[PDB]
Amino acid sequence: MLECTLVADAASGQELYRKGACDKAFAPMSTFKVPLAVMGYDAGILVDAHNPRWDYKPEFNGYAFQQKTTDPTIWEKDSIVWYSQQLTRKMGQKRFAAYVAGFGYGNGDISGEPGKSNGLTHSWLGSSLKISPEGQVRFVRDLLSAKLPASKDAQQMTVSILPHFAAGDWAVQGKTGTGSFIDARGAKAPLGWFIGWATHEERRVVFARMTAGGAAGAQPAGPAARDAFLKALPDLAKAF
Template sequence: MTKRLISALCLSAAAMWLAPTQAAAGQKVHCTVILDAESGKALHREGTCDKGFAPQSTFKLPLAVMGYDAGILKDATTPRWEYKTEWKRPKREQETTDPTTWEKDSIVWYSQEITRRLGKEKFADYARRFEYGNADVRGVKGQTDGLTEAWLMSSLKISGDGQADFMRRFVNRKLPVSNEAFARTEAIIPQFSAADGWQVHGKTGSGRMRTKAGKFDGDSWLGWFVGWAQKDGRKVVFARLNIQDWKSEEPISFFTRDSLIADLPKLVK
């Protein structure tokens, strides 16, 4: 294989991850994928589930696994970190936060404190070993810092298929971390009740899309809901993604979450 061909293949692979988030600005994208957690069989799959997009706050789930495995996070209420005014976060984030409220209220600065404590090398190593999406936590030069923003409309990308695959490895404890890291992460992920006795555990994520020039595209928003659900010993993993124009005060991720919770019992029969 010539050097030119190798280079072309590398560029093509990079484009697969970098282009979707930019090209999708202003366009409508939907994905729903549900897998049987044990067998991996696809119970439902529709839409654009093979293209990578920013994980946004769904990354708080793998980040919790990293934090517990590294000993930065201790249990459901430890550590409790005080908010600092220099972080200039929205009013809803200006509170003392522990691991449970971090996941429930989706507190960005708490995520950033975890990655700062991990450091660049360890953070990147976890992303690679988790095989999480494209595992690129370098950030975008001149736009976003890799250590504290890689997952926020930046370099890190994951598809709906990738989200479901990661969740399956998480619930089956197939990641290279301690058993305590799995159990403690499971304990802090928000839980919801669905029809027919299903219990749904998952994390939302939302953010404004970027144009090809890297600028925020005003009305085009991304919304994720990713997690697992169980009933009578049966377990499934899922990912739902919506990208569309969004002008409601309610985050698009809440719409995505609520629609998945409503749909899931019908989709897995």
């Protein structure tokens, strides 16, 4: 459908590969757990790879498979939405809004759902906040270079906690996003992300794969984008 693969060199910033429409902004969904980690570590609310450890509570109202005890590592690996929301509740509106503005993240619109005043906990979840694959790559390069307006330690910690994958000789880390949007004909259309970086020999690349439209598959769009990108990477790498 609408599909983007964008790959740049992490060190030099040079664009290495592009396919599809990569300049259209969509809801970041769970890819927003990457900047949230930076925020959480900088704020001192998140401590390390395994702390704090939070139990699920029914008032959090989380997804059935995500109703389990979570730490920062499990949060990123299993994409635990309620953990994000507990984090933003604790950091508060002032700090959240300061971080999003400081990061220059996508459209910077954290208003949330039109008539709900829920931006603090819902803005990245298929409502107000939008970012393009270009913006994602820009953000991730900044993260790896420790150039975000947050402590160096917070950015290094964030880098360390994203889940690991392998694609041939490439060692990969990255974060999925799965959501939906109402398309031009009023239909609920799937949205998928996989963003992160990959390392091989002297090279490190930063990447974003995004899919948008049209029919929901059995596999969530995020993991599907993840599998597709990992499958493609060794071939793409031949032309680096």
